[PDB]
Nucleic acid binder design. Structure first.
Ligand SMILES: [Mg+2]
Ligand SMILES: [Mg+2]
Ligand SMILES: [Mg+2]
Ligand SMILES: [Mg+2]
Ligand SMILES: [Mg+2]
Ligand SMILES: [Mg+2]
Ligand SMILES: [Mg+2]
Ligand SMILES: [Mg+2]
Ligand SMILES: [Mg+2]
Ligand SMILES: [Mg+2]
Ligand SMILES: [Mg+2]
Ligand SMILES: [Mg+2]
Ligand SMILES: [Mg+2]
Ligand SMILES: [Mg+2]
Ligand SMILES: [Mg+2]
Ligand SMILES: [Mg+2]
Ligand SMILES: [Mg+2]
Ligand SMILES: [Mg+2]
Ligand SMILES: [Mg+2]
Ligand SMILES: [Mg+2]
Ligand SMILES: [Mg+2]
Ligand SMILES: [Mg+2]
Ligand SMILES: [Mg+2]
Ligand SMILES: [Mg+2]
Ligand SMILES: [Mg+2]
Ligand SMILES: [Mg+2]
Ligand SMILES: [Mg+2]
Ligand SMILES: [Mg+2]
Ligand SMILES: [Mg+2]
Ligand SMILES: [Mg+2]
Ligand SMILES: [Mg+2]
Ligand SMILES: [Mg+2]
Ligand SMILES: [Mg+2]
Ligand SMILES: [Mg+2]
Ligand SMILES: [Mg+2]
Ligand SMILES: [Mg+2]
Ligand SMILES: [Mg+2]
Ligand SMILES: [Mg+2]
Ligand SMILES: [Mg+2]
Ligand SMILES: [Mg+2]
Ligand SMILES: [Mg+2]
Ligand SMILES: [Mg+2]
Ligand SMILES: [Mg+2]
Ligand SMILES: [Mg+2]
Ligand SMILES: [Mg+2]
Ligand SMILES: [Mg+2]
Ligand SMILES: [Mg+2]
Ligand SMILES: [Mg+2]
Ligand SMILES: [Mg+2]
Ligand SMILES: [Mg+2]
Ligand SMILES: [Mg+2]
Ligand SMILES: [Mg+2]
Ligand SMILES: [Mg+2]
Ligand SMILES: [Mg+2]
Ligand SMILES: [Mg+2]
Ligand SMILES: [Mg+2]
Ligand SMILES: [Mg+2]
Ligand SMILES: [Mg+2]
Ligand SMILES: [Mg+2]
Ligand SMILES: [Mg+2]
Ligand SMILES: [Mg+2]
Ligand SMILES: [Mg+2]
Ligand SMILES: [Mg+2]
Ligand SMILES: [Mg+2]
Ligand SMILES: [Mg+2]
Ligand SMILES: [Mg+2]
Ligand SMILES: [Mg+2]
Ligand SMILES: [Mg+2]
Ligand SMILES: [Mg+2]
Ligand SMILES: [Mg+2]
Ligand SMILES: [Mg+2]
Ligand SMILES: [Mg+2]
Ligand SMILES: [Mg+2]
Ligand SMILES: [Mg+2]
Ligand SMILES: [Mg+2]
Ligand SMILES: [Mg+2]
Ligand SMILES: [Mg+2]
Ligand SMILES: [Mg+2]
Ligand SMILES: [Mg+2]
Ligand SMILES: [Mg+2]
Ligand SMILES: [Mg+2]
Ligand SMILES: [Mg+2]
Ligand SMILES: [Mg+2]
Ligand SMILES: [Mg+2]
Ligand SMILES: [Mg+2]
Ligand SMILES: [Mg+2]
Ligand SMILES: [Mg+2]
Ligand SMILES: [Mg+2]
Ligand SMILES: [Mg+2]
Ligand SMILES: [Mg+2]
Ligand SMILES: [Mg+2]
Ligand SMILES: [Mg+2]
Ligand SMILES: [Mg+2]
Ligand SMILES: [Mg+2]
Ligand SMILES: [Mg+2]
Ligand SMILES: [Mg+2]
Ligand SMILES: [Mg+2]
Ligand SMILES: [Mg+2]
Ligand SMILES: [Mg+2]
Ligand SMILES: [Mg+2]
Ligand SMILES: [Mg+2]
Ligand SMILES: [Mg+2]
Ligand SMILES: [Mg+2]
Ligand SMILES: [Mg+2]
Ligand SMILES: [Mg+2]
Ligand SMILES: [Mg+2]
Ligand SMILES: [Mg+2]
Ligand SMILES: [Mg+2]
Ligand SMILES: [Mg+2]
Ligand SMILES: [Mg+2]
Ligand SMILES: [Mg+2]
Ligand SMILES: [Mg+2]
Ligand SMILES: [Mg+2]
Ligand SMILES: [Mg+2]
Ligand SMILES: [Mg+2]
Ligand SMILES: [Mg+2]
Ligand SMILES: [Mg+2]
Ligand SMILES: [Mg+2]
Ligand SMILES: [Mg+2]
Ligand SMILES: [Mg+2]
Ligand SMILES: [Mg+2]
Ligand SMILES: [Mg+2]
Ligand SMILES: [Mg+2]
Ligand SMILES: [Mg+2]
Ligand SMILES: [Mg+2]
Ligand SMILES: [Mg+2]
Ligand SMILES: [Mg+2]
Ligand SMILES: [Mg+2]
Ligand SMILES: [Mg+2]
Ligand SMILES: [Mg+2]
Ligand SMILES: [Mg+2]
Ligand SMILES: [Mg+2]
Ligand SMILES: [Mg+2]
Ligand SMILES: [Mg+2]
Ligand SMILES: [Mg+2]
Ligand SMILES: [Mg+2]
Ligand SMILES: [Mg+2]
Ligand SMILES: [Mg+2]
Ligand SMILES: [Mg+2]
Ligand SMILES: [Mg+2]
Ligand SMILES: [Mg+2]
Ligand SMILES: [Mg+2]
Ligand SMILES: [Mg+2]
Ligand SMILES: [Mg+2]
Ligand SMILES: [Mg+2]
Ligand SMILES: [Mg+2]
Ligand SMILES: [Mg+2]
Ligand SMILES: [Mg+2]
Ligand SMILES: [Mg+2]
Ligand SMILES: [Mg+2]
Ligand SMILES: [Mg+2]
Ligand SMILES: [Mg+2]
Ligand SMILES: [Mg+2]
Ligand SMILES: [Mg+2]
Ligand SMILES: [Mg+2]
Ligand SMILES: [Mg+2]
Ligand SMILES: [Mg+2]
Ligand SMILES: [Mg+2]
Ligand SMILES: [Mg+2]
Ligand SMILES: [Mg+2]
Ligand SMILES: [Mg+2]
Ligand SMILES: [Mg+2]
Ligand SMILES: [Mg+2]
Ligand SMILES: [Mg+2]
Ligand SMILES: [Mg+2]
Ligand SMILES: [Mg+2]
Ligand SMILES: [Mg+2]
Ligand SMILES: [Mg+2]
Ligand SMILES: [Mg+2]
Ligand SMILES: [Mg+2]
Ligand SMILES: [Mg+2]
Ligand SMILES: [Mg+2]
Ligand SMILES: [Mg+2]
Ligand SMILES: [Mg+2]
Ligand SMILES: [Mg+2]
Ligand SMILES: [Mg+2]
Ligand SMILES: [Mg+2]
Ligand SMILES: [Mg+2]
Ligand SMILES: [Mg+2]
Ligand SMILES: [Mg+2]
Ligand SMILES: [Mg+2]
Ligand SMILES: [Mg+2]
Ligand SMILES: [Mg+2]
Ligand SMILES: [Mg+2]
Ligand SMILES: [Mg+2]
Ligand SMILES: [Mg+2]
Ligand SMILES: [Mg+2]
Ligand SMILES: [Mg+2]
Ligand SMILES: [Mg+2]
Ligand SMILES: [Mg+2]
Ligand SMILES: [Mg+2]
Ligand SMILES: [Mg+2]
Ligand SMILES: [Mg+2]
Ligand SMILES: [Mg+2]
Ligand SMILES: [Mg+2]
Ligand SMILES: [Mg+2]
Ligand SMILES: [Mg+2]
Ligand SMILES: [Mg+2]
Ligand SMILES: [Mg+2]
Ligand SMILES: [Mg+2]
Ligand SMILES: [Mg+2]
Ligand SMILES: [Mg+2]
Ligand SMILES: [Mg+2]
Ligand SMILES: [Mg+2]
Ligand SMILES: [Mg+2]
Ligand SMILES: [Mg+2]
Ligand SMILES: [Mg+2]
Ligand SMILES: [Mg+2]
Ligand SMILES: [Mg+2]
Ligand SMILES: [Mg+2]
Ligand SMILES: [Mg+2]
Ligand SMILES: [Mg+2]
Ligand SMILES: [Mg+2]
Ligand SMILES: [Mg+2]
Ligand SMILES: [Mg+2]
Ligand SMILES: [Mg+2]
Ligand SMILES: [Mg+2]
Ligand SMILES: [Mg+2]
Ligand SMILES: [Mg+2]
Ligand SMILES: [Mg+2]
Ligand SMILES: [Mg+2]
Ligand SMILES: [Mg+2]
Ligand SMILES: [Mg+2]
Ligand SMILES: [Mg+2]
Ligand SMILES: [Mg+2]
Ligand SMILES: [Mg+2]
Ligand SMILES: [Mg+2]
Ligand SMILES: [Zn+2]
Lengths: 64, 53
RNA sequence: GGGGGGAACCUGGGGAACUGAAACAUCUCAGUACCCAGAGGAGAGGAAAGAGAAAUCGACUCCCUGAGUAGCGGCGAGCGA
RNA sequence: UGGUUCGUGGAGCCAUGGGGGAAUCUGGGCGGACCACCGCCUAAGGCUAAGUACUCCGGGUGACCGAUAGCGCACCAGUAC
RNA sequence: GUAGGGAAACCGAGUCCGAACAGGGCGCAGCGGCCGCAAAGUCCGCGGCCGUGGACCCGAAACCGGGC
RNA sequence: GCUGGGGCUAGGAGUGAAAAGCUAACCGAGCCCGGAGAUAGCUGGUUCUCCCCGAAAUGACUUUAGGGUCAGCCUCAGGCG
RNA sequence: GUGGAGCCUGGGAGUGAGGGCGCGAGCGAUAACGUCCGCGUCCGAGCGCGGGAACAACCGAGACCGCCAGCUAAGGCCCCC
RNA sequence: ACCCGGUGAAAUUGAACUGGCCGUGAAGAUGCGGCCUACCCGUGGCAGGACGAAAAGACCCCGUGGAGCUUUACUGCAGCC
RNA sequence: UGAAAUACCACCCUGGCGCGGCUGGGGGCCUAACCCUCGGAUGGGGGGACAGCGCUUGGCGGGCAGUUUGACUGGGGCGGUCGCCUCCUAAAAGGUAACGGAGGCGCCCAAAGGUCCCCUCAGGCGGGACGGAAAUCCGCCGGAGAGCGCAAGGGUAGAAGGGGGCCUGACUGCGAGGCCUGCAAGCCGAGCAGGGGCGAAAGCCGGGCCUAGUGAACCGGUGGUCCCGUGUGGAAGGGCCAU
């Protein structure tokens, strides 16, 4: 039977034009009152997942 | 943070938006904080007041 | 006129668990296995109190596709129009 | 409560076990809570070929088996035991 | 497959954050003599590995259904 | 009290002067067939030949510790040089 | 310094029970064929070969095949030899 | 039991051309070293050894294995209010 | 005449009364639903709108069901431990184990933060009413042995220590380049722009001398935004930024 798209991955991650995998920095969901502004700000960007981890996530997204 | 050392937000007094989170001791510092801060909405420093987190 | 039989198939009335979730309860397995009733050479469905955005289509059934999309989901495992 | 992708979700729709309970086209249901507008459709009676499923049965055909294989059984086998 | 960026509206070789014409993230740009050659890509075959299936074979103790 | 014949009560059920006894020669939940090829991070087994290379038994994390993910270490193909 | 060196992209792993020895420590008793780390080695996978009486890891030395040829290594040269 | 006539099993079994000591070896050697001893083959007997046979240790631990039982573990259900 | 003023007719209040409708709660009685029972049954007797039974509410509930009941460990249990910081072990880069040797953290500070300016310690001897080993004062010596909120370590008076003035940079938008590193995290950060603080200026300031003072994701709350809104306009609900 065909592979199914993993919905937690589709909801967290995007495959870029060249196939890198991109996700939001973790760590400002909460407990933020004492975090610096440099911290909150920097966690507000996307980062590019480490190759071996991205490579795995990419396989769960067979039809993007 | 503790029961006595609380977290609180600082609200811009001109446009009413909370722009900063910080902390204080409410035994040592019972009056509501008033601090001049840069409001990114207003694009200028503005007296901000402690408002409940 | 009925009754009883018929390998699979079919509808309806009931309906598990192992298992998976690398534990488990929701979830899954699965409306499956199985019991029961009923039909018949098929059965079911069928002639819009429909679809759903087109100023549209035009009963139902069956195949391809739409699409593992939309969504659903201890937003987990998975499920899936 | 079930059905739907929908696990209570903003949860409509279809169905209905309990309670309440109308109207007959100026009636009613629907387009995903609700309201308006704009549209779609006519519930609470019934039937309806074909295209579809199956293989006990008959036949055709195998880059299928060839007696430890192939059906459990090539043979008097659902037998002896 | 031929466009990406953005939660989205949306814009588009850009776009997102941003007040920014700042900075940054993610993106955009063949060979020979018009000819041929190669190629994005995509289709089919073959092979390796992966996912779903009992998924390399054999083995529980057990659980559940219906019967005896 | 013992005993013949004829009967009734069974599977989370019977029956028990109670031993978790007995319910067709193994009962802390009977047997048969089915779900079913349950599951088994465990044990075992894994079949012709030559040729080249050739490990690991560590780190991090892990209801993890005799299992995994990543990394380290082996090998192949392409590129660099 | 041209090596089964190195770097880059990718495909496939296996491993994630180690062990002895030397040196440096901790633990232990300045015990263990003890235990736990570090550097190194070997066995693992070199239970193939010589020496060590025998003997994975001590000494010698990395077995492509053949020879009734030569030189050596550790160790040996009285007889077993 | 033994001898002669008749009939004639069994578990077990890698193969066997299957001695003692002192050593060595995965730490209890017929199978390795050195020694000692020993002609070939049986019959009746004994049980020290072949870590003899049987039974994939029942103790112990391990498995995010099972099952019976308990309760002011969790969560539900019958039942009762 | 007071706020409003008088006879008389209304519409409506404050509170109360009696009639009535419509009802909720209790008490009594009835009979015919419903239940029981009676040789006799379209009836009699008894219970009686209770009980039973349907739907729904909340509760009690090992009677039963499904399960859960951690790991490390010189076997397991028992005890102890589990994250983070500091020192040692650690073999002079980094790293490095043991149920090895010792201690700390889970806070705090509106100043204990920024900046400008000023100041310098502990301790010893001598001197000085109450006054002491040690209160405050004077002299000399005294480089740091004191201080630095808390453990330890590193650092440090050419201040990070102590005092004062003005202040809120305990910034918003970013961020070259690195440390560390399996991942994810963690860490440092020049510079540019906006709007500020201190300073004459040079300049400093994106919390604290430093290293602990912490928690991914899921689900949800609140403020903002005004991005999506199931034919359409809204709305429901979501996204996004902040927490
Ligand atoms: Mg976050
Ligand atoms: Mg979170
Ligand atoms: Mg948030
Ligand atoms: Mg939130
Ligand atoms: Mg801080
Ligand atoms: Mg932090
Ligand atoms: Mg900050
Ligand atoms: Mg802040
Ligand atoms: Mg597609
Ligand atoms: Mg694409
Ligand atoms: Mg019939
Ligand atoms: Mg019939
Ligand atoms: Mg059915
Ligand atoms: Mg029926
Ligand atoms: Mg049913
Ligand atoms: Mg059925
Ligand atoms: Mg059942
Ligand atoms: Mg289950
Ligand atoms: Mg299964
Ligand atoms: Mg699975
Ligand atoms: Mg499971
Ligand atoms: Mg499992
Ligand atoms: Mg279990
Ligand atoms: Mg389950
Ligand atoms: Mg399954
Ligand atoms: Mg189901
Ligand atoms: Mg079937
Ligand atoms: Mg029939
Ligand atoms: Mg037909
Ligand atoms: Mg028909
Ligand atoms: Mg019909
Ligand atoms: Mg009609
Ligand atoms: Mg498509
Ligand atoms: Mg999810
Ligand atoms: Mg389903
Ligand atoms: Mg309903
Ligand atoms: Mg449902
Ligand atoms: Mg929802
Ligand atoms: Mg719904
Ligand atoms: Mg109804
Ligand atoms: Mg009408
Ligand atoms: Mg109407
Ligand atoms: Mg309707
Ligand atoms: Mg309706
Ligand atoms: Mg409607
Ligand atoms: Mg409609
Ligand atoms: Mg319609
Ligand atoms: Mg019909
Ligand atoms: Mg026809
Ligand atoms: Mg038909
Ligand atoms: Mg046919
Ligand atoms: Mg045939
Ligand atoms: Mg033939
Ligand atoms: Mg034969
Ligand atoms: Mg046969
Ligand atoms: Mg033959
Ligand atoms: Mg036959
Ligand atoms: Mg036969
Ligand atoms: Mg026969
Ligand atoms: Mg750009
Ligand atoms: Mg760029
Ligand atoms: Mg091609
Ligand atoms: Mg693969
Ligand atoms: Mg299968
Ligand atoms: Mg298979
Ligand atoms: Mg496979
Ligand atoms: Mg099996
Ligand atoms: Mg059993
Ligand atoms: Mg069970
Ligand atoms: Mg059971
Ligand atoms: Mg049964
Ligand atoms: Mg039964
Ligand atoms: Mg009798
Ligand atoms: Mg009898
Ligand atoms: Mg009897
Ligand atoms: Mg009985
Ligand atoms: Mg019985
Ligand atoms: Mg029975
Ligand atoms: Mg049973
Ligand atoms: Mg029980
Ligand atoms: Mg049972
Ligand atoms: Mg019983
Ligand atoms: Mg008895
Ligand atoms: Mg007992
Ligand atoms: Mg039997
Ligand atoms: Mg018996
Ligand atoms: Mg049982
Ligand atoms: Mg029995
Ligand atoms: Mg059966
Ligand atoms: Mg199954
Ligand atoms: Mg199977
Ligand atoms: Mg299991
Ligand atoms: Mg095989
Ligand atoms: Mg080699
Ligand atoms: Mg290990
Ligand atoms: Mg390791
Ligand atoms: Mg860690
Ligand atoms: Mg980890
Ligand atoms: Mg394991
Ligand atoms: Mg790997
Ligand atoms: Mg290498
Ligand atoms: Mg190459
Ligand atoms: Mg080369
Ligand atoms: Mg090599
Ligand atoms: Mg190599
Ligand atoms: Mg590789
Ligand atoms: Mg391969
Ligand atoms: Mg592996
Ligand atoms: Mg392994
Ligand atoms: Mg391991
Ligand atoms: Mg080991
Ligand atoms: Mg080791
Ligand atoms: Mg090693
Ligand atoms: Mg070890
Ligand atoms: Mg060593
Ligand atoms: Mg030496
Ligand atoms: Mg040593
Ligand atoms: Mg040491
Ligand atoms: Mg001694
Ligand atoms: Mg040795
Ligand atoms: Mg050792
Ligand atoms: Mg030693
Ligand atoms: Mg030692
Ligand atoms: Mg070693
Ligand atoms: Mg090995
Ligand atoms: Mg060697
Ligand atoms: Mg080697
Ligand atoms: Mg050797
Ligand atoms: Mg040898
Ligand atoms: Mg060898
Ligand atoms: Mg040797
Ligand atoms: Mg030798
Ligand atoms: Mg020798
Ligand atoms: Mg020759
Ligand atoms: Mg010579
Ligand atoms: Mg020599
Ligand atoms: Mg000699
Ligand atoms: Mg001799
Ligand atoms: Mg004789
Ligand atoms: Mg005889
Ligand atoms: Mg022999
Ligand atoms: Mg002999
Ligand atoms: Mg020895
Ligand atoms: Mg011996
Ligand atoms: Mg011998
Ligand atoms: Mg020999
Ligand atoms: Mg010997
Ligand atoms: Mg000998
Ligand atoms: Mg002798
Ligand atoms: Mg004898
Ligand atoms: Mg004996
Ligand atoms: Mg004996
Ligand atoms: Mg022996
Ligand atoms: Mg013996
Ligand atoms: Mg034995
Ligand atoms: Mg044996
Ligand atoms: Mg077994
Ligand atoms: Mg065993
Ligand atoms: Mg055992
Ligand atoms: Mg036991
Ligand atoms: Mg044990
Ligand atoms: Mg156990
Ligand atoms: Mg567990
Ligand atoms: Mg485990
Ligand atoms: Mg278990
Ligand atoms: Mg159990
Ligand atoms: Mg009772
Ligand atoms: Mg009365
Ligand atoms: Mg009466
Ligand atoms: Mg009456
Ligand atoms: Mg009465
Ligand atoms: Mg009542
Ligand atoms: Mg009734
Ligand atoms: Mg109610
Ligand atoms: Mg209830
Ligand atoms: Mg229980
Ligand atoms: Mg309970
Ligand atoms: Mg289960
Ligand atoms: Mg538990
Ligand atoms: Mg648990
Ligand atoms: Mg238990
Ligand atoms: Mg647990
Ligand atoms: Mg354990
Ligand atoms: Mg112990
Ligand atoms: Mg262990
Ligand atoms: Mg140990
Ligand atoms: Mg021990
Ligand atoms: Mg041990
Ligand atoms: Mg304990
Ligand atoms: Mg410990
Ligand atoms: Mg922690
Ligand atoms: Mg060190
Ligand atoms: Mg050191
Ligand atoms: Mg070091
Ligand atoms: Mg060193
Ligand atoms: Mg490093
Ligand atoms: Mg001050
Ligand atoms: Mg300070
Ligand atoms: Mg100051
Ligand atoms: Mg002094
Ligand atoms: Mg004095
Ligand atoms: Mg005095
Ligand atoms: Mg004094
Ligand atoms: Mg000091
Ligand atoms: Mg302290
Ligand atoms: Mg001022
Ligand atoms: Mg960077
Ligand atoms: Mg990193
Ligand atoms: Mg300035
Ligand atoms: Mg500025
Ligand atoms: Mg100025
Ligand atoms: Mg700066
Ligand atoms: Mg401080
Ligand atoms: Mg601090
Ligand atoms: Mg979750
Ligand atoms: Mg979770
Ligand atoms: Mg949320
Ligand atoms: Mg709308
Ligand atoms: Mg809008
Ligand atoms: Mg709508
Ligand atoms: Mg309007
Ligand atoms: Mg609009
Ligand atoms: Mg409004
Ligand atoms: Mg809203
Ligand atoms: Mg909103
Ligand atoms: Mg956010
Ligand atoms: Mg922001
Ligand atoms: Zn403002």
């Amino acid at each position: 039977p065909k592979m199914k798209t993993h919905k937690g991955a589709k909801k967290r991650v995007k495959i870029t034009a060249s196939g890198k995998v991109v996700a939001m920095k973790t760590g400002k969901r909460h407990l933020n009152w004492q975090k610096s502004g440099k911290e909150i700000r920097q966690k507000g960007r996307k980062f590019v997942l480490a190759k071996p981890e991205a490579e795995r996530i990419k396989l769960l997204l067979p039809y993007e | 943070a503790s029961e006595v050392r609380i977290k609180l937000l600082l609200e811009c007094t001109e446009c009413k938006r909370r722009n900063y989170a910080t902390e204080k001791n409410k035994r040592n510092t019972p009056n509501k904080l008033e601090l001049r801060k840069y409001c990114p909405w207003c694009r200028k420093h503005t007296v901000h007041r402690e408002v409940k987190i």
